Curated annotation (Swiss-Prot), chain F:
Keywords, alphabetical: Cytoplasm, Ribonucleoprotein, Ribosomal protein
Keyword Ubl conjugation among record annotations: no
Spans annotated as Disordered: 1-24
Record GO cellular component, one term: cytosol
An example Gene Ontology biological process: cytoplasmic translation
Function in brief: Component of the ribosome, a large ribonucleoprotein complex responsible for the synthesis of proteins in the cell. The small ribosomal subunit (SSU) binds messenger RNAs (mRNAs) and translates the encoded message by selecting cognate aminoacyl-transfer RNA (tRNA) molecules. The large subunit (LSU) contains the ribosomal catalytic site termed the peptidyl transferase center (PTC), which catalyzes the formation of peptide bonds, thereby polymerizing the amino acids delivered by tRNAs into a polypeptide chain.
Protein name stated in the entry: Small ribosomal subunit protein eS32A
Length: 113, 91, 202, 76, 23, 24
RNA sequence: GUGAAGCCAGAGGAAACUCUGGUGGAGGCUCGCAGCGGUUCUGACGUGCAAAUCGAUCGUCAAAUCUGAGCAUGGGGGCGAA
RNA sequence: UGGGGAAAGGUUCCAUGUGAACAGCGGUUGGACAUGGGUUAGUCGAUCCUAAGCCAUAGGGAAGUUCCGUUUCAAAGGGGCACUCGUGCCCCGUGUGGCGAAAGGGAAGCCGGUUAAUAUUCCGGCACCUGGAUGUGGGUUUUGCGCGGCAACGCAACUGAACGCGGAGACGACGGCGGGGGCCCCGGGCAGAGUUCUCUUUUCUUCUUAACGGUCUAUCACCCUGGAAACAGUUUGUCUGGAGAUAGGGUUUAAUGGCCGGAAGAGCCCGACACUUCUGUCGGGUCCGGUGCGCUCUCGACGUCCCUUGAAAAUCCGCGGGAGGGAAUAAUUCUCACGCCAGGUCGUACUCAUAACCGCAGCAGGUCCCCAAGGUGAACAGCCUCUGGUUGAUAGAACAAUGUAGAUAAGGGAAGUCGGCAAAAUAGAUCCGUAACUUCGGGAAAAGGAUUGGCUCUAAGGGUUGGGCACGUUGCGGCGUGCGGUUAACAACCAACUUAGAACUGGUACGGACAGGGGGAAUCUGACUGUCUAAUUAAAACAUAGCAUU
C-alpha cells in the first residue's frame, strides 16, 4: 500500500509545467497522472473584477465552446461588469445634457448684441 | 503590558548599528507604516504601496506623495503660493 | 526599478487619426488616477499641467524643463527637485532659470515645463544601515558595489600602490590635463579640506 | 459512453446507419438488464429493472442488427 | 480578553448576570 | 473569431453557389 | 529557543497620563539535522585509495545562503569584497 | 546498497557456446571472447514563439584579411475580384530579415493484456484535437436577423466587413488558518496462513475502480426588500457598515465531492476436477464504520517586507460600429445534434555510478533532479524492523616485539610541557534562583540548587440530537400559522490526546542504550553578520553602514 511512484515522461524537474496527481487504478496500483494548468477568469475592463457567468479556461479552449456560454445578454456583454455599464449610461446622458444648456446660454446671453 | 520602554518599533534591530542610528530610522518607520484618512472618500484606509505611491483600500485611488509621508511641507507651501499667485492676480 | 520619482501613465487622443496614444511622464506630488491634465500654450496654472515658460509668471516652480523647445525634457527630473523661473526678456525671447545645483542659465522662452515639484519627497533622509540594503540598491542599477581602496592594492594595480605602510606617497590632487591611467584622486581641485565658512560662488 | 433515458429514443438510435452491433448484459445479483449499442462515436447504454419488457424490447429491435448475450468470463 | 477560563466559567457568569437583571 | 475560421465559411458559400448554378 | 510593532480586557489618577494579564509573530537573532566550508590533532597515509584523499573534533545553516543550463569578457589583455 | 530520469558513453541490452589473453588469489561464472537477435506514436519530445545574445540588408571606415552599423540621412509592403483562357482591374500602407530553450510559453490518450529482450508506441476496449469537404434533424424569418427574469443573469442554436477598445498567455519571498486527493492509525465481518506445555473471541495478508461524459452541490463576489446609538456583525490574528450594516430571499467563478454511464464482462483472493503434451473446465467472494496541532501534493481567503515592487512573443476570445446579404414557399456565411476524409519527418535498447560518465584503471575522489513505510522520540537526530536489494571486495593457521584504531587504572591532581596539546569532566525535560556593566534592546541556558522507574487510582479540559399549547393541509404525519416560555440547565449517545494530585513497591535505582552546553575575574585588538591566498598562513588583513573632500 505505501508504494512509491515515478514520472511518466522524460522531464525530471519540478517546473510550472510538470504537474502531476496520484490515482489508483482498477488494477490495484498507485500511479501518477499528468495534468494541465488551471484556467483563469476574465476580468472587467474598467474596474478589474471577475465577470460573473463566464467559465475559466486556458486561452485556446475558448475556440470550441458555443457563443452564448462566452457572453451575457447586455451591452458590453463580456469585458464589463454591469455596474460599470450603469455608470457609462448615466454619465453619457448627463454630460450630453449639460452640453446643450452651455451652448444655448453662451449663444443667447452673450451674443445677443 | 507596555513590554518596551523606549526602543519602540526599532526593537527588531537588537543591539546593532548604534543608538543614534536606530533613533533616526525609527522616526521614518513610524510614519511610513501608519494609516491616513482618504481625501476623496473619507475612510481611514490609505497605506504606502511604493516609495512615492499611496493607495486607498476602499475607493481604489492612488496618489503621488512623499517618501515616508503622504505630503511634504515643501509641496504644501508651494500649493498655497501657487494658489495665491494665480488667484489674487487673475481673480 | 532603479529610480525614485514614480512615473505616470497618461492617455491622449490623436487629432488626425482614429486611435489613442499612451505617454509616460514623471509624476509631480499631488497627481492622482482619474485626473485631467492639460498641455499647451493656453493651459491653466495648475499642478500637473505642461505649458511654455513664456506663459508663466516669475517665481513659479516647474520640473522636467526642456533645454531647447522640442527635446522633450532634460532638467530637474529627480525626486524632490525643481527649477525656478527668475525673469523674462520678451523682446528677444529668453528666460532666466535657477537649477538645483544653484547655477543660473538662460533658455529660449518656448521651452516647456510641468507645474509643481517632483514626487518622491525626502528619500535620502533615512540611513541604509545595512550592507544588504545598499547591495539591493545598486543590484538594479550597475556593477559598482562593493569598492576596494586603491591604497590597499599592489603597485601594478593602482597608482597608490604598495609600500610597507598604507599611504599615498605623493600629492593626491591631479592636474586637469593628465593621461588616462594617472587620474586617480581629486581631479583639478581648486581647494581641499574641511569647508569652514560660506561658499562664495553661487 | 452516454446513457439513454427512455425506450423510444433507444429504438431510434438503433435505427441508424452507423449502428454496428448490440449486446445484452444481465446482472442477476442486482436484477438489472442492460442494452448497449455500438455506434460511430459513442456507446449507448439503457438500464432496465424488470424483465417483462426486455423480451418485448428485444423483438422490437430491427432484424438486421446483431445481438449477443455477453457470456461470463469472456475469453481473451 | 482573558476572562473566562473554560466553558463552565462562562455559564456561571451568565446565570448571575440574568439574576441581577431580574431585579 | 479568427480570420482563417471566417475564410472557410465564405469559401463554402462560393462553392455552393457555383454548384447550385451547375445544378440549374 | 527568544518574543518587536499592531490589537482585546481589567485596574489607578482631577487631568496629562500610568500599571497588570492576554493576543500577535518581527529580526543580514539564536541551538541544531541535510547541503556548503575547512580550525586543531602540527592524527592516518606520505614509492598513498588519492599528483591534496581518510578519521575524529570544528564554522555557517532562511539570507551578502547553495546550485543546473544558455550567454558575455581573450594575454601587457580579462577578471579581482585585493 | 530501492524504483525512475537529465548531461556523458555507444551496444555495454537478450539467448546459445568457448582453448589462450583480461577480471593484481581461483574461475565451469563475466560489462571479457565467438555466433545470432532486439528500439513500432496525429495524442510523449523535437519541430512553433520569443529572452540574454549572434548574424544578413541601407550606409560609413580600412592597403587588406575585414571593422562598425540592426532602423538608420533607404523609392524597403499586402489584400481582394473576374479571367473565354495567366495577360486585366480595385483597395490599404508609419516600419522594414533570420538564428537562438529536449528545465521558460504551448492543441489533443486512458485502463487491461502481451516478449528471451519494446511499449502512454504492439493487441483488445473505450476517447480526444486540428485541418478539409459536406448532408439530414432541429432553430429563425409571412411586417426580415430568438425568447425569458424587477435584477444579478439564464436557455441546444439565435447575421455582422473596414477600423478601434479590452481580457487571457503573464509571473516575488515568507507566516498562521480552512477545504480536497493519497499515505499512516483504530473497530467489525467473510476467506487463507502462523503459534498453541500454559495464555491469547488471538497475530499477519487481500477486500480495487482510469481517461472521457451526465446530473446535484461546494468559500469570494454580485443582486432585490429595508433603514441601524442602549451601535451592531465578526477572525487564532480588528476589520466591515447611511458611498447602506444585521436579517430575509436570490444569481454566479471554482471538483482531485455524492450518484450514474465507462464497469465487472476487468483485476485480485479462495475451492473442486481435468491435463504426458496439445490443453484446460467449473463453482464461491470481492463488504461496513471511526479518528487527527499526523506526513505529502493541491486549492482558497487573509497578513508581513522593500531607497529591492519581482520577463517577452507567438496564439485564442469578447465587445463598440453597422458594410454587405437574405422568405412567403421557400430562404437561411444558424459558434446546436449526428454523420464523411486525413494527419508526413527524426529520437525511443541499456547504465546513470564503491565496475557502463571524468580522473592514464573495474581508482575509498568528483558529477543536476522526482517518489519516500512501522517503533522510540520535539524531530528527515541516533538505534531496531517491513517491502525491495545485497551476502561483492585474495584466503588458511598462530597470538612475539614495535605499531594504527578502541579502552580502563590505587594515592596525588598540571609537579609534565614553549604552551592543559590530547583526553576527562558538563549536557534532555519540569520547578526554584540569577551579579557587575549597558547604546535599555541585552548580559542570560549568567552563576547555583531540587525532581525523573513500575503498578493501582482520583480530578480537569469537548461534540451531536430533543424540548408546551390552539386551528388547517399532507401518507407517528412534515408543515402554513396564532401564540406561550427561557427548563433555578436536564436526558441519551459519541471521542482522542494533554495537564495536575495520592497510595503502594525495589540491593536509592529510574533523560538507566542512543542522544546530549564546562564555568568565572581581566588585558590587547577588529564595531557587528559577510569575504580571500584550489594544494603549508582564515587573521588584527579585505568589505561594510556612517563621515568628509573633488
Ligand atoms: K454561463
Ligand atoms: K537627455
Ligand atoms: K561587484
Ligand atoms: K572600501
Ligand atoms: K593604520
Ligand atoms: K593611510
Ligand atoms: K521566530
Ligand atoms: K552541519
Ligand atoms: K603575455
Ligand atoms: K509527432
Ligand atoms: K489515425
Ligand atoms: K528531431
Ligand atoms: K514539424
Ligand atoms: K534581441
Ligand atoms: K566594406
Ligand atoms: K520548449
Ligand atoms: K520487438
Ligand atoms: K429545418
Ligand atoms: K430558439
Ligand atoms: K515565466
Ligand atoms: K491543506
Ligand atoms: K491533507
Ligand atoms: K486526507
Ligand atoms: K500514524
Ligand atoms: K486526459
Ligand atoms: K452605524
Ligand atoms: K496564531
Ligand atoms: K518537496
Ligand atoms: K444589417
Ligand atoms: K522505448
Ligand atoms: K526505457
Ligand atoms: K542520463
Ligand atoms: K517514526
Ligand atoms: K528516527
Ligand atoms: K596481536
Ligand atoms: K602486537
Ligand atoms: K602546567
Ligand atoms: K616558558
Ligand atoms: K539530570
Ligand atoms: K588601559
Ligand atoms: K565575521
Ligand atoms: K589560509
Ligand atoms: K575564521
Ligand atoms: K584580504
Ligand atoms: K566615525
Ligand atoms: Mg597586500
Ligand atoms: Mg605605476
Ligand atoms: Mg604619481
Ligand atoms: Mg603606496
Ligand atoms: Mg544567522
Ligand atoms: Mg548559529
Ligand atoms: Mg600531520
Ligand atoms: Mg609508511
Ligand atoms: Mg548481459
Ligand atoms: Mg555465458
Ligand atoms: Mg587473476
Ligand atoms: Mg587462471
Ligand atoms: Mg574462463
Ligand atoms: Mg564484446
Ligand atoms: Mg505534446
Ligand atoms: Mg556584422
Ligand atoms: Mg561598406
Ligand atoms: Mg527558432
Ligand atoms: Mg517546456
Ligand atoms: Mg472536424
Ligand atoms: Mg459585433
Ligand atoms: Mg465511477
Ligand atoms: Mg460530476
Ligand atoms: Mg446576508
Ligand atoms: Mg456504476
Ligand atoms: Mg471478478
Ligand atoms: Mg528495461
Ligand atoms: Mg541512479
Ligand atoms: Mg568512483
Ligand atoms: Mg573511465
Ligand atoms: Mg510520539
Ligand atoms: Mg588473513
Ligand atoms: Mg593507544
Ligand atoms: Mg588515577
Ligand atoms: Mg581514585
Ligand atoms: Mg582536586
Ligand atoms: Mg583540546
Ligand atoms: Mg544552568
Ligand atoms: Mg559574562
Ligand atoms: Mg571582524
Ligand atoms: Mg593554502
Ligand atoms: Mg589552513
Ligand atoms: Zn467593472
Ligand atoms: Zn478613499
Amino acid at each position: 500500500a505505501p508504494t512509491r511512484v515515478t514520472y511518466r515522461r522524460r522531464n525530471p524537474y519540478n517546473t510550472t509545467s510538470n504537474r502531476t496527481r496520484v490515482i489508483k487504478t482498477p488494477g490495484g496500483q498507485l500511479r501518477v497522472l499528468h495534468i494541465k494548468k488551471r484556467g483563469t477568469a476574465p476580468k472587467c475592463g474598467d474596474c478589474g473584477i471577475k465577470l460573473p457567468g463566464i467559465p475559466a479556461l486556458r486561452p485556446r479552449e475558448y475556440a470550441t465552446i458555443s457563443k452564448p456560454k462566452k457572453t451575457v445578454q447586455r451591452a458590453y456583454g463580456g469585458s464589463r461588469c454591469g455596474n460599470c455599464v450603469r455608470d457609462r449610461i448615466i454619465r453619457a446622458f448627463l454630460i450630453e445634457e449639460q452640453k446643450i444648456v452651455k451652448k444655448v446660454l453662451k449663444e443667447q446671453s452673450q451674443a445677443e448684441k | 503590558s507596555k513590554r518596551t520602554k523606549k526602543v519602540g518599533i526599532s526593537g527588531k534591530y537588537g543591539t546593532r548599528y548604534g543608538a543614534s542610528l536606530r533613533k533616526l530610522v525609527k522616526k521614518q518607520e513610524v510614519t511610513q507604516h501608519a494609516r491616513y484618512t482618504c481625501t476623496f472618500c473619507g475612510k481611514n484606509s490609505v497605506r504606502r504601496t511604493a516609495v512615492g505611491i499611496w493607495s486607498c483600500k476602499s475607493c481604489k485611488k492612488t496618489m503621488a506623495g512623499g517618501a515616508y509621508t503622504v505630503s511634504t511641507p515643501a509641496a504644501a507651501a508651494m500649493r498655497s503660493t501657487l494658489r495665491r499667485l494665480r488667484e489674487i492676480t487673475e481673480a | 526599478p532603479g529610480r525614485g520619482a514614480p512615473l505616470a501613465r497618461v492617455v491622449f487622443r490623436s487629432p488626425y487619426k482614429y486611435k489613442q496614444i499612451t505617454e509616460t511622464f514623471i509624476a509631480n506630488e499631488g497627481m492622482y488616477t482619474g485626473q485631467f491634465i492639460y498641455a499647451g500654450k493656453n493651459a491653466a496654472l495648475t499642478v500637473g499641467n505642461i505649458l511654455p515658460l513664456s506663459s508663466v509668471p516669475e517665481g513659479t516652480v516647474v520640473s522636467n524643463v526642456e533645454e531647447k523647445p522640442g527635446d522633450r525634457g532634460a532638467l530637474g527630473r529627480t525626486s524632490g527637485n525643481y527649477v525656478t523661473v527668475v525673469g523674462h526678456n520678451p523682446d528677444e525671447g529668453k528666460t532666466r532659470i535657477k537649477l538645483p545645483s544653484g547655477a543660473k542659465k538662460v533658455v529660449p522662452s518656448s521651452s516647456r515645463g510641468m507645474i509643481g515639484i517632483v514626487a518622491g519627497g525626502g528619500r535620502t533622509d533615512k540611513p541604509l544601515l545595512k550592507a544588504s540594503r545598499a547591495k539591493h540598491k545598486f543590484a538594479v542599477k550597475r556593477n559598482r558595489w562593493p569598492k576596494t581602496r586603491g591604497v590597499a592594492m599592489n603597485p601594478v594595480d593602482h597608482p597608490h600602490g604598495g609600500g610597507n605602510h598604507q599611504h599615498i606617497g605623493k600629492a593626491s590632487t591631479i592636474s586637469r590635463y593628465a593621461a588616462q591611467g594617472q587620474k586617480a584622486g581629486l581631479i583639478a581641485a581648486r581647494r581641499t579640506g574641511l569647508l569652514r565658512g560660506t561658499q562664495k560662488t553661487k | 459512453p452516454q446513457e439513454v433515458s427512455d425506450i423510444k429514443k433507444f429504438i431510434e438510435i438503433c435505427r441508424r446507419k452507423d449502428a454496428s452491433s448490440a449486446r445484452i448484459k444481465k446482472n442477476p445479483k442486482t436484477q438489472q438488464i442492460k442494452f448497449k449499442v455500438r455506434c460511430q462515436r459513442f456507446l449507448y447504454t439503457l438500464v432496465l429493472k424488470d424483465s417483462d419488457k426486455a423480451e418485448k424490447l428485444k423483438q422490437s429491435l430491427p432484424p438486421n442488427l446483431q445481438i449477443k448475450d455477453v457470456p461470463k468470463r469472456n475469453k481473451r | 480578553g482573558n476572562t473566562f477560563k473554560h466553558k463552565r466559567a462562562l455559564v456561571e457568569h451568565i446565570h448571575r448576570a440574568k439574576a441581577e437583571k431580574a431585579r | 473569431m479568427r480570420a482563417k475560421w471566417r475564410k472557410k465559411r465564405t469559401r463554402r458559400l462560393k462553392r455552393k453557389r457555383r454548384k447550385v448554378r451547375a445544378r440549374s
